[PDB]
Write an enzyme that holds these catalytic residues in place. Structure first.
Site, PDB file in Angstrom:
ATOM      1  N   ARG A  30      -3.582  -3.255   4.950  1.00  0.00           N
ATOM      2  CA  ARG A  30      -2.387  -2.771   5.616  1.00  0.00           C
ATOM      3  C   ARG A  30      -2.017  -3.794   6.691  1.00  0.00           C
ATOM      4  O   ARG A  30      -2.887  -4.196   7.473  1.00  0.00           O
ATOM      5  CB  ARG A  30      -2.621  -1.404   6.250  1.00  0.00           C
ATOM      6  CG  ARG A  30      -1.502  -0.959   7.181  1.00  0.00           C
ATOM      7  CD  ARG A  30      -0.365  -0.357   6.383  1.00  0.00           C
ATOM      8  NE  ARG A  30       0.672   0.318   7.130  1.00  0.00           N
ATOM      9  CZ  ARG A  30       1.536  -0.146   8.016  1.00  0.00           C
ATOM     10  NH1 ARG A  30       1.558  -1.417   8.378  1.00  0.00           N
ATOM     11  NH2 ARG A  30       2.420   0.677   8.581  1.00  0.00           N
ATOM     12  N   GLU A  38       9.584   2.315   3.177  1.00  0.00           N
ATOM     13  CA  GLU A  38       8.731   2.628   2.056  1.00  0.00           C
ATOM     14  C   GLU A  38       9.430   2.600   0.705  1.00  0.00           C
ATOM     15  O   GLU A  38      10.609   2.943   0.658  1.00  0.00           O
ATOM     16  CB  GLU A  38       8.184   4.065   2.217  1.00  0.00           C
ATOM     17  CG  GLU A  38       6.677   4.095   1.956  1.00  0.00           C
ATOM     18  CD  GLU A  38       5.953   3.403   3.098  1.00  0.00           C
ATOM     19  OE1 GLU A  38       5.063   4.036   3.694  1.00  0.00           O
ATOM     20  OE2 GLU A  38       6.300   2.238   3.385  1.00  0.00           O
ATOM     21  N   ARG A  82      -8.318   1.096   4.305  1.00  0.00           N
ATOM     22  CA  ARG A  82      -7.615  -0.198   4.207  1.00  0.00           C
ATOM     23  C   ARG A  82      -7.977  -1.171   5.311  1.00  0.00           C
ATOM     24  O   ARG A  82      -8.067  -0.761   6.481  1.00  0.00           O
ATOM     25  CB  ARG A  82      -6.105   0.078   4.292  1.00  0.00           C
ATOM     26  CG  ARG A  82      -5.614   1.061   3.247  1.00  0.00           C
ATOM     27  CD  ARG A  82      -4.125   1.276   3.363  1.00  0.00           C
ATOM     28  NE  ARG A  82      -3.748   2.044   4.552  1.00  0.00           N
ATOM     29  CZ  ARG A  82      -2.474   2.348   4.787  1.00  0.00           C
ATOM     30  NH1 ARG A  82      -1.530   1.956   3.929  1.00  0.00           N
ATOM     31  NH2 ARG A  82      -2.181   3.039   5.874  1.00  0.00           N
TER      32      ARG A  82
END
Length: 136
Positions: A30, A38, A82
Site C-alpha cells: 500500500r 478507487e 500489506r
C-alpha cells in the site's frame, strides 16, 4: 536512516496498491501517505479519476527498469498484511508523482510514518494551484 531496497513487479492492482516480489516473496504494498480514488472501493466502487490514478501507477511501474521500496520508521505492515512503503520507479517516487499530478490526495498521517510528509504536501499544494485532475 531510511534506505531503498530492490523489489520486482508482480502486478499493479490500483492507484495506490501494487503487488511486488520482495526478499523473495510476493507481497501486496500500500503506498504510504496517499489516497487515490478507487476502482474497487469497499463501498462505492469506481470513483472519478480512479481509472486514471490506476493507469498512472500501472504505467509507471510497468515501464521502469528498477523498482525500489522504502519503508518508513514506524510499522511496516497494516492490519491487512500489506507492506507500507514509499515506492520508487527508476528513482522517482510513485507516491509523489501521483500527488503532483492531482491523482491522489495526501492521506491522514500517522506518526512516526510521516518522513516524506512535507515534500508530498508541497506537491499537493502545487497540483491544487495548477487545478489538476482531482483539483479541477
Amino acid at each position: 536512516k531510511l534506505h531503498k531496497e530492490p523489489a520486482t513487479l508482480i502486478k499493479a492492482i490500483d492507484g495506490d496498491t501494487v503487488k511486488l516480489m520482495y526478499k523473495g516473496q510476493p507481497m501486496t504494498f500500500r503506498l504510504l501517505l496517499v489516497d487515490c480514488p478507487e476502482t474497487k472501493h469497499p463501498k462505492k466502487g469506481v470513483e472519478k479519476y480512479g481509472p486514471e490514478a490506476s493507469a498512472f501507477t500501472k504505467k509507471m511501474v510497468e515501464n521502469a527498469k528498477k523498482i525500489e521500496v522504502e519503508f518508513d520508521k514506524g510499522q511496516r505492515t497494516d492490519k491487512y498484511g500489506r507492506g507500507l512503503a514509499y515506492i520508487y520507479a527508476d528513482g522517482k517516487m510513485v507516491n509523489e508523482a501521483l500527488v503532483r499530478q492531482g491523482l491522489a490526495k495526501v492521506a491522514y498521517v500517522y506518526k512516526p510514518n510521516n518522513t516524506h510528509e512535507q515534500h508530498l504536501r508541497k506537491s499537493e499544494a502545487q497540483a491544487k494551484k495548477e487545478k489538476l485532475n482531482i483539483w479541477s
